[PDB]
């Protein structure tokens, strides 16, 4: 039954097409039908369209058989028929209603083509024609990407509908034109990128934060490869220049995500502007703690762009972060006590009784205590406990004990040029081989991203870089490799290319040199590439097969080749495919290591399809190891959207049903995948449960280690309880298990420290941070690295680390104490509103404080508003006409 | 002991407008689901591992026979014989065979017995009768703290009670206070109690055990207290854990002198629950959460400060909480611009969270009545009295 | 099995007879055409009973 009262609609809009010959009647009825369909679809908010429902059935027969109409007029009457047939597009026609668009609204444009559409709110030819230019245009660009003019006039039609979508309704469809541009213009994405550039950047300034959030979230999970992942990365480049706010330190972000492009894009986004450098661009420099070369680019060679040329360089490097950190520890938040290893190793009151002595100064436990003491007071200039009076303490170990204890002592004074060398001068003339090598390690340790102008590591270690002693070479080359983590200057290359190219150095020495050079350069370094490959060729089969250090050579290659796509990896596979079956491990290492954040199926499809399942029943050892370790590489943080089912596919599938030798220790991946301390998500179930299961030795030892990830500052409560449940009460008797238990579960106390590679903003990783990859392959090997004390420098290699502190300054010093709002993350940005990263207050700390990733801060009450809006632990409370 | 449970998938809802950002995110989810499926399929496709011990296992099975009836080890005697009660309830003095792990025998553990000549032949640590297994949450509810509007103090208290101890508890023994063993939610119906329980079970890191309260009662004598005991044994066994007993007044009513056997058994079930709640130390990581509307009708021994210290009040939502709830429940709606939503919030009523949700649903229905989906203000205006059915005018003016 | 207790078949899911009798196997003979008045009531009952079931998409 129909409405009856308005039963004229199934009569007059029915007889007008039914009566349909006489051209004058044709034109008049077409005009009337246009008017009625417009008056209905355009303002009548009822989704139901009286004509469109009553045109249907009749429309699919009349307006389809009358669609030809023999073109009675040139196009105007045909224009009327097309305007009529463009009404019953959604339901009257089949799925190729996009073909209806082709021959009804793409072939012809009724004057202003949206004359009967732009009036419609979103449906008739905005949501509908949006669907058609993201479905028809999608299939045609898939099959006929460069078509006839049916690809260019459709492109311009998409252009005006896309911009109108911003200015036909001015509503939250502002999130649909970025959507359209992502889908529409599949291969010509950049054309639509420039289209919304020239539209939105000139339309209105506030309607661009939505653009940025959309493109950022798509940047997190774009298409599989960086052909349009790169294009979406480049989309906000117009949306960051003077077309929007110029400060926008996020230039470092959308240059970092695309291969960390410094000398092609950062040359223009910050190196060319250099105009508001006195503003937060200086803290943009400060929040750019990876790419010293960026400011060396203008500062050193001219020293005339701004007076803060080398002083700004030095201050953001290490010195003032150290000073404000010390202020946070002593002056402001009084948590800077005398904290050695002993103060908390016996933090359990169970160890007091039942010992019956059990006090042994053996190598493993004393070594673990030295490592723990070094880790706990990292970057602390106050650990005068096992340092000065403890010369005999440094003496009371086994041979590797000296080198590790001295490296730990150097770690105590992290990134401190003055204190570090005035405390290593006493141990520089150590008068013992192993302690001397540890001393060179300490000297190369106080250069953790320091980028010292005086370059103390180079000169101070060049006497021993090639000196005839394996421990000397190990210490020297490892220290220099840690010193030059950021840049790849030709001096260090011309110094170590002879070294790793030297046959005098052992294959452990060659491997650690490879690790050094791989974390020296993160680009190509074709000299390094050729040198490493001619190594892997000139080595003999047994040596390259079962060295126990043969991993580090392809590990160095991958660490050099980390981040950049499979471009160099193609030829790398070509000239490693000619190698021994160990090249399988080498390839599945270097290739996948070329992706730090590349969250995609196809690559992890190879890892879990050809590398995992085509290796489950196959006993090719250590091929599955890197497989599952790097399952979370390229997946370490795709906004953690790709991390949780990584946890699921690892715990459910890998740990539960994996091989006892190639996949049962698929567990340091958990260390790499996500590190904050989360019960039943990263730490409690998957680690503690497999840790109680001490059935597999390597699994248990490595699993106790894996808490090192969360151990940066886990708020050791519920993690220390674990340790006390396994110290004395657990794997106490097992000497090596207890050693790693002490080391890993006790180096938590290093306060205000953070090992995660993903940056503070969260949308960018940090390649220098990702150089904590060598103590993942080495840590999984467990043979002569961790469980066996063959080489403990990899455990020392954890100086890819940043503070977790907070602080605010106003162009001078940290003295500002504005209230902060740190609390767990919530929805923001791409939803209806950018709700603050903290859902509520939580802690209301006004002084500078601590901020782990599930604790991010927001400003208060609008005093001296920071234009950084990133709070990279060094926020700039820059004043303005505050409280306007 | 083993670890917690209740695995859930990803929050998504980072967008919710189907702007293809939802599509990339769900595509990543589905792709990784395909990865898991392919991996496990191909693993079981090639997984040859069996036999090994065989003949020793074969003869120990032959000694075990078939079937082997499970029993509850009530008491142990010198380490060759023990007292075990069959599931019927009759208990026998049986022998313990050599191949059973004497360390595992502990009063309460399910022990495999020979069908003929009963004898302890194995130990089951995962009996977990189907009732308590069902009472365990597997797929966490989709609601979240973002879905809760208002109740800031309530969420804050419930997190201090059943999140802060499971996460870093160092503050609690730093201050010397014990963590609050057990919290109870109360207030008028439809205020956000069960919703808060869902939200807690979502952002949780412990085994969540949902209980109806009336579910604990069982027909057969001794089945009630046995079920309560097994439920809490599972809670401790899967510690840390959260035991949510909804509608606690189904059993928590005033204790009175029982006459009928059924009333006696109900009293016994509550006594077992209270004794069990006393049994585990507050330092232990098993917390209980009970909700009820009729708080006054509860036993004043279930709410003793030594047993259930916290008491979270859920008042009818205020005007600001009403507007937060309306923002939450109209978020998905395609509201027209003319709707103000402040007239309904103004109207001094007893609108609850559930009442607001129903008002929104009825407004959507009325919009559908006019063939539209834009939902004007008139639809809300009529929906308010459509849902709100039922002081004599000028008394108090 | 009899007393060997060997699982030898899988049977449909357990519903106890008391609640299985509750299913309306034999539909009753009462049409909306035999209901006078109540047109508004019938539409309201349908908007909750059959509209969500028939079409949850709206």
């Amino acid at each position: 039954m129909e409405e009856g009262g308005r039963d004229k609609a199934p009569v007059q809009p029915q007889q007008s097409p039914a009566a349909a010959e006489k051209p004058s009647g044709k034109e008049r009825r077409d005009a009337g039908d246009k008017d009625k369909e417009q008056e209905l679809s355009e303002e009548d908010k009822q989704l139901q369209d009286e004509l469109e429902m009553l045109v249907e059935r009749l429309g699919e027969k009349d307006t389809s058989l009358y669609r030809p109409a023999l073109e009675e007029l040139r196009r105007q009457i045909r224009s009327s028929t097309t305007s009529m047939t463009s009404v019953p597009k959604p339901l009257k026609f089949l799925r190729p209603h996009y073909g209806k668009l082709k021959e009804i609204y793409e072939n012809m444009a009724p004057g202003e083509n949206k004359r009967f559409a732009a009036d419609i709110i979103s449906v008739l030819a905005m949501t509908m024609s949006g669907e058609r230019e993201c479905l028809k245009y999608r299939l045609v660009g898939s099959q006929e990407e460069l078509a006839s003019w049916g690809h260019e006039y459709v492109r311009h039609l998409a252009g005006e509908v896309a911009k109108e979508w911003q200015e036909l309704d001015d509503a939250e469809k502002v999130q649909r034109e970025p959507l359209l541009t992502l889908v529409k213009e599949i291969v010509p994405y950049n054309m639509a990128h420039n289209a919304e550039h020239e539209a939105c950047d000139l339309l209105m300034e506030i309607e661009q934060v939505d653009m940025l959030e959309k493109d950022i979230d798509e940047n997190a999970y774009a298409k599989v490869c960086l052909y349009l992942t790169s294009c979406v990365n480049y989309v906000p480049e117009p949306e960051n220049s003077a077309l929007l706010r110029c400060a926008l330190g996020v230039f470092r972000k959308f240059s970092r995500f695309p291969e960390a492009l410094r000398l092609a894009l950062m040359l223009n986004d910050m190196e060319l502007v250099e105009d508001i450098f006195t503003s937060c661009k200086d803290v943009v420099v400060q929040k750019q703690m990876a790419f010293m070369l960026g400011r060396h680019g203008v500062f050193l060679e001219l020293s005339e762009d701004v007076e803060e040329y080398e002083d700004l360089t030095e201050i953001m490097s290490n010195v003032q972060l150290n000073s404000n950190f010390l202020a946070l520890a002593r002056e402001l938040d009084i948590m800077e006590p005398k904290v050695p290893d002993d103060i908390y190793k016996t933090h359990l009151e169970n160890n007091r009784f039942g010992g019956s002595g059990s006090q042994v100064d053996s190598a493993r436990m004393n070594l673990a205590s030295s490592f723990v003491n070094g880790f706990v007071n990292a970057a602390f200039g106050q650990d005068k406990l096992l340092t000065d009076d403890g010369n005999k303490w440094l003496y009371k170990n086994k041979d590797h004990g000296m080198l590790s204890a001295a490296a730990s002592l150097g770690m105590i004074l992290l990134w401190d040029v003055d204190g570090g060398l005035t405390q290593i001068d006493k141990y520089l003339y150590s008068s013992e081989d192993y302690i001397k090598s540890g001393a060179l390690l300490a000297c190369g340790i106080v250069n953790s991203g320091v980028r010292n102008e005086c370059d103390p590591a180079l000169a101070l270690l060049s006497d021993y870089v090639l000196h005839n002693s394996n421990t000397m070479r190990l210490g020297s080359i490892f220290g220099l490799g840690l010193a030059y983590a950021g840049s790849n200057r030709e001096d260090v290359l011309t110094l170590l290319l002879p070294v790793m190219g030297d046959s005098k150095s052992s294959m452990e020495v060659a491997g650690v040199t490879a690790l050094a050079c791989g974390m020296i350069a993160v680009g190509s370094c074709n000299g390094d590439v050729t040198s490493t490959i001619l190594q892997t060729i000139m080595e003999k089969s047994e040596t390259e097969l079962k060295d126990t250090y043969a991993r580090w050579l392809p590990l160095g290659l991958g660490l050099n080749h980390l981040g950049k796509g499979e471009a160099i990896e193609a030829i790398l596979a070509a000239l490693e495919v000619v190698s021994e079956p160990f090249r399988s491990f080498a390839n599945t290492l270097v290739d996948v290591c070329a992706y730090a954040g590349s969250g995609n199926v196809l690559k992890v499809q190879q890892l879990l399809h050809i590398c995992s399942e085509h290796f489950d029943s196959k006993e090719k050892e250590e091929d599955k190891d890197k497989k599952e370790k790097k399952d979370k590489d390229k997946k370490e943080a795709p906004a953690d959207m790709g991390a949780h089912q990584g946890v699921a596919v690892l715990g459910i599938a890998l740990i539960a049903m994996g091989e006892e030798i190639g996949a049962e220790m698929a567990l340091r991946t958990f260390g790499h995948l996500l590190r904050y301390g989360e019960p039943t998500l990263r730490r409690a179930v998957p680690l503690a449960l497999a840790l109680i299961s001490v059935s597999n030795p390597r699994l248990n030892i490595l699993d106790t280690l894996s808490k090192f990830s969360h151990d940066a500052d886990p708020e050791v409560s519920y993690n220390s309880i674990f340790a006390m449940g396994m110290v004395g009460s657990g794997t106490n008797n097992a000497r090596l298990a207890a050693m790693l238990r002490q080391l890993a579960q006790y180096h938590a106390k290093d306060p205000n420290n953070l090992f995660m590679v993903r940056l503070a903003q969260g949308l960018t990783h940090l390649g220098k941070g990702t150089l904590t990859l060598c103590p993942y392959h080495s840590d999984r090997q467990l043979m002569s690295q961790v469980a066996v004390a063959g080489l403990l420098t990899v455990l020392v290699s954890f100086l890819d680390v940043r503070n977790i502190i907070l602080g605010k300054s106003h162009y001078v010093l940290y003295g500002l104490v504005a209230a902060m709002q740190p609390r767990m993350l919530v929805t923001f940005d791409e939803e209806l509103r950018p709700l603050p990263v903290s859902v509520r207050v939580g802690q209301a700390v006004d002084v500078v404080g601590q901020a782990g990733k599930p604790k991010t801060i927001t400003g208060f009450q609008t005093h001296t508003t920071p234009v950084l809006l990133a709070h990279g632990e060094r926020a700039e409370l820059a004043t303005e006409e505050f409280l306007p | 002991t083993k670890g917690p449970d209740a695995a859930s998938k990803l929050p998504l809802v980072t967008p919710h407008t189907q702007c293809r950002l939802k599509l990339l995110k769900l595509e990543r989810i589905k792709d990784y689901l395909l990865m898991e499926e392919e991996f496990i399929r191909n693993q079981e496709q090639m997984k040859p591992l069996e036999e090994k011990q065989e003949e020793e296992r074969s003869k120990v099975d032959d000694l075990r026979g078939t079937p082997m009836s499970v029993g509850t080890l009530e008491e142990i005697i010198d380490d060759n014989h023990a007292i075990v009660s069959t599931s019927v309830g009759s208990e026998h003095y049986v022998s313990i065979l050599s191949f059973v792990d004497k360390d595992l025998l502990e009063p309460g553990c399910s022990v495999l017995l020979n069908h003929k000549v009963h004898a302890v032949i194995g130990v089951l640590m995962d009996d977990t009768d189907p009732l308590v297994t069902v009472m365990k949450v597997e797929k966490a509810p989709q609601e979240t703290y973002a879905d809760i509007g208002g109740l800031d103090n309530q969420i804050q208290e419930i997190k201090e009670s059943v999140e802060l101890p499971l996460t870093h508890p160092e503050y609690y023994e730093e201050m010397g206070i014990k963590p609050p063993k057990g919290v109870i939610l109360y207030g008028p119906p439809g205020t956000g109690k069960t919703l808060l329980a869902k939200a807690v079970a979502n952002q949780t890191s412990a085994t969540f055990l949902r209980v109806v309260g009336s579910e604990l009662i069982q027909k057969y004598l001794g089945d009630g207290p046995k079920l309560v005991r097994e439920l809490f044994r599972v809670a401790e066994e899967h510690a840390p854990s959260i035991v949510f007993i909804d509608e606690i007044d189904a059993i928590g009513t005033k204790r009175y002198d029982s006459n009928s056997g059924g009333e006696r058994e109900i009293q016994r079930t509550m006594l077992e629950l209270l004794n069990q709640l006393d049994g585990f130390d507050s330092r232990g990581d098993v917390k209980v959460i009970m909700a009820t509307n009729r708080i006054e009708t509860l036993d004043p021994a279930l709410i003793r400060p030594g047993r259930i210290d916290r008491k979270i009040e859920f008042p009818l939502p205020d005007e600001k909480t009403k507007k937060r709830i309306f923002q939450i429940h109209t978020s998905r709606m395609t509201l027209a611009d003319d709707v103000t939503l402040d007239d309904l919030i103004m109207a001094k009523d007893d609108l609850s969270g559930a009442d607001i949700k129903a008002i929104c649903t009825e407004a959507g229905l009325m919009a559908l009545r006019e063939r539209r989906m834009k939902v004007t203000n008139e639809d809300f205006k009529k929906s308010k009295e459509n849902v709100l059915y039922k002081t004599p005018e000028g008394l108090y003016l | 099995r009899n007393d060997s207790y060997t699982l030898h078949k899988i049977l449909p899911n357990k519903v106890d007879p008391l609640v299985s009798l509750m299913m309306v196997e034999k539909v009753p003979d009462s049409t909306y055409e035999m209901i006078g008045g109540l047109d508004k009531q019938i539409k309201e009952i349908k908007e909750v009973i059959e509209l969500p079931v028939k079409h949850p998409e709206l």
Binding site: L47, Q48, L91 | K22, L26, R371 | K43, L51
Partner: peptide, 30 residues
Amino acid sequence: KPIRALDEGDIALLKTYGQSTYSRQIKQVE
């Protein structure tokens, strides 16, 4: 006012027209 039951055409039009262009793939994927 006698409120009309939504017709099959009305159901069909409600399922479309006022829909996001990504309803189909989103629902299918979920």
